[PDB]
Design a protein around this ligand. Structure first.
Ligand SMILES: Cc1cc2nc3c(=O)[nH]c(=O)nc-3n(C[C@H](O)[C@H](O)[C@H](O)COP(=O)(O)O)c2cc1C
Ligand SMILES: Cc1cc2nc3c(=O)[nH]c(=O)nc-3n(C[C@H](O)[C@H](O)[C@H](O)COP(=O)(O)O)c2cc1C
Lengths: 139, 145
């Protein structure tokens, strides 16, 4: 039992999330391949204002932020050092629909980028937690 | 087309992991994995099983960089330039060797050396893949201190 969870330092089971992605009915977006450098956030929609409960190394690398600086915050801070992508994401998330947009975001140093953002709200799990996954990519 | 914007290497590592997760007759329970996991992918149909991909977690765990380790066999991790040669060879090495050869899952613990010479008890798990559209067999390794 000393090896329980040694392959997730966060104790988050991202692979559980991957399984949900693959199992979703009526998938509308194909992610294509993901590797371990992927920018990825998990937000708990079951908590008020969809706070970040996990971000991959790839997200920190993309944005220049660190864990204490972003954990527990809504992803919208990325939009500031407004776009119709914002409302497209708001509405999709509300309907629990998959959505993909391009939108201008900003790294910690204030540098703007065009971020290709995919959000899969997925679903509330029997515990009631509701992990939404977002993937980011600088184009 | 947005295909491949979420894998700069082109490789579907996470599709690889998912297949693994749901494999029949598992022998080891991997447990939870996150995106920091140290991971190597080796093409064992190519001479001396070269690394064709290592995760950010692998470079963070071991201290090497991509161009230092790509194309190389993973055994360099058993070597510190600042240790004396071994007669004391771990059973871990043979177990890995024999498992790889039989396309068998295997999990051992063994001493490796970060690039700065520090030993760590690496818990290495090696899993087999099926022949890719290539006809090539791969092995996925998961490392962790
Ligand atoms: C899992 C997840 C990841 C998200 N990632 C991003 C992102 O990378 N960039 C961004 O601008 N918005 C992202 N968002 C969108 C914002 O968090 C927010 O939902 C958006 O601004 C619409 O809501 P609002 O009108 O209240 O601000 C993400 C949302 C979720 C649920
Ligand atoms: C995917 C993969 C990952 C491996 N990862 C490690 C590792 O992290 N540490 C280690 O000491 N050996 C690792 N090995 C083992 C060596 O690469 C090699 O197979 C082992 O030393 C046995 O072969 P040998 O007797 O020729 O040295 C890995 C092998 C494979 C195929």
């Amino acid at each position: 039992g000393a090896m329980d969870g040694i392959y997730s330092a966060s104790g988050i089971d991202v692979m559980g999330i991957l399984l949900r992605i693959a199992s979703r009915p009526n998938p509308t977006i194909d992610l294509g391949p993901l590797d371990c450098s992927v920018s990825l956030t998990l937000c708990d929609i079951s908590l008020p204002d969809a706070p970040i409960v996990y971000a991959s190394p790839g997200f920190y690398q993309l944005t220049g932020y660190s864990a204490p600086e972003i954990m527990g915050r809504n992803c919208r801070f990325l939009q500031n050092s407004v776009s119709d992508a914002v409302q497209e994401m708001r509405r999709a998330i509300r309907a629990h629909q998959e959505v993909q947009v391009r939108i201008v975001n900003y790294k910690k140093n204030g540098t703007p980028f065009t971020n290709v953002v995919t959000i899969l709200p997925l679903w509330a799990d029997p515990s009631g937690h509701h992990f939404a996954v977002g993937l980011q990519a600088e184009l």
